[PDB]
């Protein structure tokens, strides 16, 4: 066996038996290297079969390791460049051993964001602050084609939530996108979700500005006025001074005039107004999200799909309440099936075909790319799992595989 | 015999020779003929002040109306001018039918003011953009001048001025050009919808604001400062509704997608954004007032109307409280609740007009009986039946006959009314 230490950039070849557990090898590593350091975090990684040495209690043989195998001793927590929905990169170190689902959970607990199951990871202080862009040129610089096929192509980058980061080709300090994957936001509470709402509003703002989602001019002007309103509401949160021609003594009962001087009353009102503006700021972003949620093209994830009796590449669209057969160019809905009528769905991994069973004996089938099937399967099962909130074991189970919809009405 | 009639608007007294078999319309005809004038008598109607009744039934004879000889009645236009003080404390002149029952008068007024659900409002005796805009006073001096005694007995005295919704203004000693208060009478507001109730919400907010500023309702210092902060915020949001100019350090072009930079100039964008911003601030304005109201609704002493009453085993004049869902026996010195009765457990309630006594029958055959003043008896009766009628409101056109049936009392459209919402 050969174990490569990435940190010290040195490879160690060891004499291995086969009756010594994985922990024994790790222990032998600590003693032999003759270096005063901390090895507590590191874990063995197998690049060949792309599996972690998860259980260190296991011996050598029941892991299926041949002779002269080149293992890797690398730290679990590596540098990871994350781009928040606010399009600002933050540097964090997360566990590359845990499942992406549990990884997202930890990241959101760190970022003060409730319900991490609505979020996931996607390939390519200031958590609460939201400000517009310095100049229109930056938007044009960030401007992408954002066509349906281009958007559908980027949807392949959704990580397997049942696997880890290391198993899915994620290098150290490689850019991953933290995005709201599912568009079923349960319990948006301004009392707890000051950051959660802010990032969701940011994702909605950037999706509209970069024309990732299509809307009319009237709606565009409204959204533009909304974040203008949000900007003015934000300024009020910092202001600790009188800004209008109103005398604060006119806003209170005359008994407090005898209890306080004017400077005292002005101070307590300004302090309270910062709290008032703080809630108005949040509820404003709430309205932005509401208007965003009410768009006719909201909450649809596109995947290239081949439908029965179709000679052209089309699109399968996945939403929180339905899935849609769509036109690849226009994006017009050909037919819409709803999740409330679904009994179960099947996934043939050989043919790469998804078959969905609905009520009243209607049946849908389509075919996708190899990578898309796993992503679509997780998208489907994920959306059903989110329709049951009122349990991590439930999610992993829902995500030739056959899964019965636990919310079938019929 | 002879009939003397005074035409109010013409300032003329007319004597008419009548028998008694002459119809009401007959008097009106002989009145017009003898005057010999060219005028529109459409709105004019006979009024008898001594007996406080309109004489609208034209087909009736003088015998049916019990009009004795030498009676001096009036021929006056039904619609007269009235001064109303809105919940925003601003006065306004309106023309209303002084022969219509107050309940209809209030509804017509609310229709004019574009206020939905007029059954929650009514007129109270004093002890177009004026309806929409909210503005704080100029100085603390104004608040000090309007500061009236808010003691519980003083509020109980004020509540004697609530007009009978089953009778008309003329029948209740309300002269032309006099001042009446338009207030939210019942504290149970059905469907406060911001999409329609911009005026309704504004006035309700004003009534809440003024009740707090004049200490008509109690609140903690923390709550008071929060209410003050809300006012400051609402005033600021109100300013934004008029602003048609940039007031921040943000470029409006960074708020739109790049395709609009190719279609519009910088000014065309800034203008259409500010135009939309006024509507955004408008909605924020309404939502801010809603938060003020719901906070006002959550106050411990909210939604209670007080009346002086003597109870069965009382040693004193006490206070009977009427909330939206309950009757409360309160001490008139501390305002503490002695005993509370739920409306849901009320099978029935009676009003003995002779002894001026109200008796309520409950479940488990528990009984409550108290005595008020002559005026308070019908006012309290309307409050009980009114709040009940409000409970019959479903999300599904108001049933006027139902409202009167619950609140008319001794007026036709010992009184006994069965609660239609008696649970079990």
UniProtKB/Swiss-Prot annotation, chain B:
Expressed in which tissues: Detected in adult heart muscle (at protein level). Detected in heart, skeletal muscle and testis.
Pfam families: FERM_M, Kindlin_2_N, PH
Domain of life (superkingdom): Eukaryota
Effect of a null allele: Complete embryonic lethality at peri-implantation stage, due to severe detachment of the endoderm and epiblast from the basement membrane. Heterozygous mice lacking one copy of Fermt2 show no visible phenotype, but show decreased tumor angiogenesis upon transplantation of tumor cells, and their blood vessels are abnormally leaky.
Modified residues (Phosphoserine): 397
UniProt keyword Acetylation, yes or no: no
GO MF term set: actin filament binding; phosphatidylinositol-3,4,5-trisphosphate binding; protein serine/threonine kinase activator activity; protein serine/threonine kinase binding; SMAD binding; type I transforming growth factor beta receptor binding
Residue ranges, annotated region (Interaction with membranes containing phosphatidylinositol phosphate): 23-64
Keyword match Cytoplasm: yes
Any GO BP annotation: protein localization to cell junction
InterPro entries: Band_41_domain, FERM_2, FERM_central, Kindlin/fermitin, Kindlin_2_N, PH-like_dom_sf, PH_domain, PH_Kindlin/fermitin
Record membrane topology: Peripheral membrane protein
Keywords, alphabetical: Cell adhesion, Cell junction, Cell membrane, Cell projection, Cell shape, Cytoplasm, Cytoskeleton, Lipid-binding, Membrane, Nucleus, Phosphoprotein, Wnt signaling pathway
Annotated compartments: Cytoplasm; Cytoplasm, Cell cortex; Cytoplasm, Cytoskeleton; Cytoplasm, Cytoskeleton, Stress fiber
CC annotations in GO: adherens junction; cell cortex; cell surface; cytoplasm; cytoplasmic side of plasma membrane; cytosol; focal adhesion; I band
Purpose of the protein: Scaffolding protein that enhances integrin activation mediated by TLN1 and/or TLN2, but activates integrins only weakly by itself. Binds to membranes enriched in phosphoinositides. Enhances integrin-mediated cell adhesion onto the extracellular matrix and cell spreading; this requires both its ability to interact with integrins and with phospholipid membranes. Required for the assembly of focal adhesions. Participates in the connection between extracellular matrix adhesion sites and the actin cytoskeleton and also in the orchestration of actin assembly and cell shape modulation.
Family: Belongs to the kindlin family.
Subunit structure: Interacts with ITGB1; the interaction is inhibited in presence of ITGB1BP1. Interacts with FBLIM1. Interacts with active, unphosphorylated CTNNB1. Identified in a complex with CTNNB1 and TCF7L2/TCF4. Interacts with ILK, ITGB1 and ITGB3.
Domain notes: The FERM domain is not correctly detected by PROSITE or Pfam techniques because it contains the insertion of a PH domain. The PH domain binds phospholipids. Binds preferentially phosphatidylinositol-3,4,5-trisphosphate, and has lower affinity for phosphatidylinositol-4,5-bisphosphate.
Name the UniProt record assigns to this protein: Fermitin family homolog 2
Lineage of origin: Eukaryota, Metazoa, Chordata, Craniata, Vertebrata
Name of the gene this protein is made from: Fermt2
């Amino acid at each position: 066996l050969s174990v490569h230490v990435t940190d010290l950039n040195r490879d160690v070849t060891l004499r291995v038996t086969g009756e010594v557990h994985i922990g024994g090898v790790m222990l032998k590593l600590v003693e032999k290297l003759d270096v005063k350091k901390d090895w507590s975090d590191h874990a063995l990684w197998w690049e060949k079969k792309r599996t972690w040495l998860l259980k260190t209690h296991w011996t050598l043989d029941k892991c299926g390791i041949q002779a002269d195998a080149k293992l890797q001793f690398t730290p679990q927590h590596k540098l990871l460049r994350l781009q928040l929905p606010n399009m600002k990169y933050v540097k964090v170190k997360v566990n590359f051993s845990d499942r992406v689902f549990k990884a997202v959970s930890d990241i959101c607990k760190t970022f003060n964001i409730r319900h991490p199951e609505e979020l996931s990871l996607l390939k390519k202080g200031i958590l609460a602050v939201s400000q517009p862009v310095t100049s229109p040129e930056i938007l044009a610089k960030m401007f992408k084609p954002q066509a349906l096929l281009d958007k559908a192509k980027t949807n392949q980058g959704w990580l397997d939530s049942s696997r880890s980061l290391m198993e899915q080709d994620v290098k150290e300090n490689e850019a991953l996108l933290l995005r709201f994957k599912y568009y079923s936001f349960f319990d948006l509470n301004p009392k707890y979700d000051a950051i959660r709402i802010n990032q969701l509003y940011e994702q909605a703002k950037w999706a509209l500005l970069l024309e990732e989602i299509e809307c009319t001019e009237e709606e565009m002007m409204m959204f533009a006025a909304l974040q203008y309103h949000i900007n003015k509401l934000s300024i009020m949160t910092s202001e600790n001074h009188l800004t209008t021609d109103v005398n604060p003594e006119c806003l209170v009962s005359p008994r407090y005039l005898k209890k306080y001087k004017s400077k005292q009353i002005t101070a307590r009102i300004l302090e309270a107004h910062q709290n008032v503006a703080q809630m108005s700021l949040i509820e404003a972003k709430m309205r932005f999200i509401q208007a965003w949620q009410s768009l006719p093209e909201f909450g649809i994830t596109h995947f290239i799909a081949r439908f029965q009796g179709g000679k052209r590449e089309e699109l399968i669209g996945i939403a929180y309440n339905r899935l849609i057969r769509m036109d690849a160019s226009t994006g017009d809905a050909i037919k819409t099936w709803r999740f409330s009528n679904m009994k179960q769905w099947n996934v043939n991994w050989e043919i790469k075909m998804v078959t969905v069973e609905f009520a009243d004996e209607v049946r849908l089938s389509f075919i996708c790319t190899e990578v898309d099937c796993k992503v679509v399967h997780e998208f489907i099962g994920g959306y059903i799992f989110l329709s049951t909130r009122a349990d991590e074991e439930m999610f992993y189970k829902l995500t030739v595989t056959t899964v019965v919809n636990p919310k079938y009405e019929g």
